[PDB]
Structures are given as structure tokens and as C-alpha cells.
């Protein structure tokens, strides 16, 4: 089967709860960090340290 077999294949699915929790957590943390840095850079800003 190769000369004639023609059975399709699929991509490897990641159904793991641990890595799905990790992916959703890290994507939420990264998008909220990007959003807060963008909003603090394009407006009035404060700083806990001198000129930070």
C-alpha cells in the first residue's frame, strides 16, 4: 500500500489539559502586559523609581 494505498493523514493534535492551561495562561499574561505597556507609554505615566 504506497503504490496504491491512499489513506489520508492529519496533524498531531495537542489535547493535553496541562499545556492548554499553560498556553491560555501565558497568552493572557502576554496580551495584558503588552496592553498595559502600550497604554502607559502613550499617556501620562508614574513610576515607583526615579525616572523609570
Amino acid at each position: 500500500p504506497h503504490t496504491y494505498i491512499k489513506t489520508p493523514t492529519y496533524r498531531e493534535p495537542v489535547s493535553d489539559y496541562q499545556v492548554l492551561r499553560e498556553k491560555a495562561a501565558s497568552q493572557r499574561r502576554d496580551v495584558e502586559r503588552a496592553l498595559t505597556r502600550f497604554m502607559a507609554k502613550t499617556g501620562e505615566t508614574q513610576s515607583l523609581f526615579k525616572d523609570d
Partner: protein, 188 residues
């Protein structure tokens, strides 16, 4: 819980607390409270509970030697247009700062805010917090034991708080906590 984990930092020769000589533990805590406070600025909570918790945690980090002891952030959160929980958390941080750093101008800022603030509940709360966490007691020798402060607080008991009946009793409590039942000692 993040604020409870903060232990006092090991400053060497009173080294200025800058960003490079930060604790590797406290940098993660500071990143998290910065993320939380900034996200509260865009998606606010029910009664700004995360603002109150993050201001309390920044005061915890300032009480140890981690963040520079600067009251300007809490002085900006204690303005009139903010929610009242943010205001009393920021004013609690300013009262704690003027107790630890013996600040004269912060005590004059707090007494001015007692005299002319629009919300009378905030004035009563500032007198209450300055009674609970006083800048000095009667036993302490402090630089803030002038005749000028005795005259200001006697003028605040006598006049000034004549319109509320709760600010006047709070000023009596503050004068009792600071100078006691007898004649103020730090006086001619």
C-alpha cells in the same frame, strides 16, 4: 498574600534603592502589582479592591528597603476625584510615611486636607488614622514637637472644626494622643 511575603531587604551602607540592586524575589512581586494596578486602570474592579490592595502592597514594599520612600504616588491617589476607598488607602499610606520618615511637609499636607476637603467622611478618617498611627506620642522626642504644631492643633480644636461635632472630637483625640492631658511639654 504577595505583600505578606516581603521581608526587609539587606541594604548595605544605606545604599540608594535603585532598579539594578533590587531583590530577585521582589522584582517578580513588583511586576505583578504593576500589571494588576495598570489593568485596574483599564478594567476596574467592583470597588477598586485591587487598587486598594496594590497601594497597600506598594506601601509594604516601601516600608522595607525595596522601593524608594516617596509619597508622591499616594499623594496623587489621595486627590478628590478618586473613589473613597482608594482615597483612604492612599491617605493611610501617607500617614504611615509621615510616621516613619518624620516628614513635616506631609503632616502639614494632612492637616491642610483635614481643614479643607469636600468630603467630611474623609476628614474624619484622616483624623482617625492620624490618631491610630500617630506621628509621635507624648513620650517621644521628635522634630515635629514645635510650638507651631501645638498652636495649629489648638486652633483646630478651638476654631476650624466648629462645624461638624465629629471633627472636633477627632481633633481632641489627636491632641490627647500627641500631647496628653497636661500642658504640651515641648513648649516655653
Amino acid at each position: 498574600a504577595l505583600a505578606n511575603s516581603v521581608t526587609p531587604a539587606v541594604s548595605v551602607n544605606n545604599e540608594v534603592r535603585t532598579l539594578d540592586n533590587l531583590n530577585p524575589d521582589v522584582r517578580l512581586i513588583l511586576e505583578e502589582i504593576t500589571r494588576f494596578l495598570n489593568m485596574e486602570k483599564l478594567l476596574p474592579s467592583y470597588r477598586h479592591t485591587i487598587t486598594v490592595s496594590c497601594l497597600r502592597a506598594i506601601r509594604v514594599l516601601q516600608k522595607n528597603g525595596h522601593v524608594p520612600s516617596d509619597p508622591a504616588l499616594f499623594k496623587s491617589y489621595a486627590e478628590y476625584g478618586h473613589f473613597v476607598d482608594i482615597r483612604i488607602a492612599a491617605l493611610e499610606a501617607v500617614v504611615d510615611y509621615t510616621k516613619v520618615d518624620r516628614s513635616y511637609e506631609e503632616l502639614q499636607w494632612l492637616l491642610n486636607m483635614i481643614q479643607n476637603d469636600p468630603v467630611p467622611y474623609v476628614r474624619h478618617k484622616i483624623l482617625n488614622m492620624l490618631t491610630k498611627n500617630p506621628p509621635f506620642t507624648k513620650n517621644m522626642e521628635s522634630p515635629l514637637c514645635n510650638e507651631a504644631l501645638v498652636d495649629q492643633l489648638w486652633k483646630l480644636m478651638n476654631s476650624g472644626t466648629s462645624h461638624d461635632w465629629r471633627l472636633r472630637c477627632g481633633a481632641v483625640d489627636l491632641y490627647f494622643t500627641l500631647f496628653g492631658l497636661s500642658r504640651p511639654s515641648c513648649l516655653p
